[PDB]
């Protein structure tokens, strides 16, 4: 059985090799780990390594992220897997559902919401609250707002006509 | 020429006079080793182009005394 | 040469501020640093003084070569092994927002012929001094 580190796992989720992720299910079935624990988290800012699949994609389409999401369900906790957000106060409550809205990425934004994404999450971290002279972006603090305010109509059409989840159009 | 007069006028500020640069990490130099230049921040805002550029330092958005370097550098 | 000017000297002191001469000496400036990198990236090009002492930037604003100074202040380059020939730079860009960060190499007074300092303590007889404080690093 081949020995994982978190760093390898990053290292791996985000050069885009698949080959490399492949040992990792039959390791994780071994260790009776989940991906969704404080030793694959980093911390200082609480991001899992489906985040750092969500930061680093090579040409619009990352390939690792379907693999580690089939991780996650074959170790029963997809939900609590798209649903990990930052722990940090600067970043407080942005999922991976934020990053695929940000990234401009519409199959990025299905692949997520079938999976269990929250379209409720409140990012609500001091870089996306107003912080009157500090630099931030703030949107509203939900993925049907942060498809609104940046300029996606196919995404915010999408939020709220999806079969799994839809979006409340009155939350605040 | 008053900004500049007022340096010339303290060794000490001088070494204030460093202008917010941070001494900050630009990417990797020929060799592969730290750039490390003193870089003045300006934020800015654009509504039509979305700037998905190919040579971006942080992944992490903002700056909170917690920074993370972006993979795309061939270095 | 004779004067100690090389190849990025002497487009400056080519360049006469106009609308068609900025265009291309300043696309010139960039093919010659990119070539500069990719025949030997061990040399960095303007370190290089004539014997005046001045470096490129600050040649160009010892004389009145605006559109030289507004262009390698702002220097992006995108290709890949001449990334760092840039001199401005972008560290995050989330949606509408991205945080420019411009090199304060030779400028920002603690070199010797520092351009902030070349252009305020001009002798008047070089043009466009109060428009070469207008470029996007030396305003702010």
């Known amino acids: ?73 074959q170790t029963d906790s997809l939900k609590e897997f798209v649903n990990a957000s930052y722990t940090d106060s600067y970043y407080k409550g942005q999922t991976a559902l934020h990053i695929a809205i940000e990234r401009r990425n519409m199959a990025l934004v299905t692949l997520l919401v079938e999976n269990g994404a929250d379209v409720q999450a409140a990012a609500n971290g001091d870089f996306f609250k107003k912080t009157k002279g500090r630099p931030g972006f703030y949107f509203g603090e939900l993925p049907l707002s942060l498809a609104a305010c940046t300029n996606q109509l196919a995404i915010v059409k999408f939020l709220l006509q999806n079969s799994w989840q839809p979006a409340d159009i009155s939350a605040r | 020429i008053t900004i500049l007069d007022t340096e010339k006028s303290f060794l000490k500020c001088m070494r204030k006079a460093f202008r917010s640069g941070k001494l900050l990490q630009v990417g990797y130099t020929p060799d592969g080793k730290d750039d490390y230049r003193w870089c003045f921040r300006v934020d800015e805002v654009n509504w039509t182009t979305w700037n998905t550029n190919v040579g971006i330092i942080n992944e992490d958005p903002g700056n909170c005394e917690g920074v993370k370097r972006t993979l795309s550098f061939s270095l | 040469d004779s004067v100690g000017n090389t190849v990025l000297h002497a487009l400056v002191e080519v360049a006469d ?105 001009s002798s008047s007889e070089t043009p466009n001094r109060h428009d070469m404080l207008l470029v996007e690093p030396l305003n702010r």
């Open chain 1, 1 to 73: 059985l081949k020995l994982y580190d978190r760093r390898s796992i990053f290292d791996a989720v985000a050069q885009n090799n698949c080959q490399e992720l492949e040992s990792l299910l039959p390791f994780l079935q071994k260790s009776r780990k989940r991906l969704t624990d404080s030793e694959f988290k980093d911390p200082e800012t609480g991001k899992t390594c489906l985040l750092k699949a969500m930061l680093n994609l090579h040409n619009g389409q990352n390939d690792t992220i379907s693999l580690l999401l089939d991780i996650a369900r």
């Open chain 3, 17 to 121: 501020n106009t609308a068609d001469n900025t265009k291309f000496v300043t696309s010139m400036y960039n093919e010659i640093l990119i070539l500069g990198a990719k025949l030997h990236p061990t040399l960095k090009l303007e370190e290089l003084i004539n014997k005046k002492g001045l470096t490129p930037l600050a040649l160009a604003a010892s004389s009145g070569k605006i559109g030289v100074l507004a262009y390698i202040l702002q220097r992006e380059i995108q290709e890949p092994e001449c990334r760092h020939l840039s001199r401005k730079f972008t560290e995050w860009a989330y949606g509408p927002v991205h945080s420019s960060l411009y090199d304060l190499s030779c400028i920002d007074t603690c070199e010797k012929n520092s351009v902030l300092e070349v252009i305020a303590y």
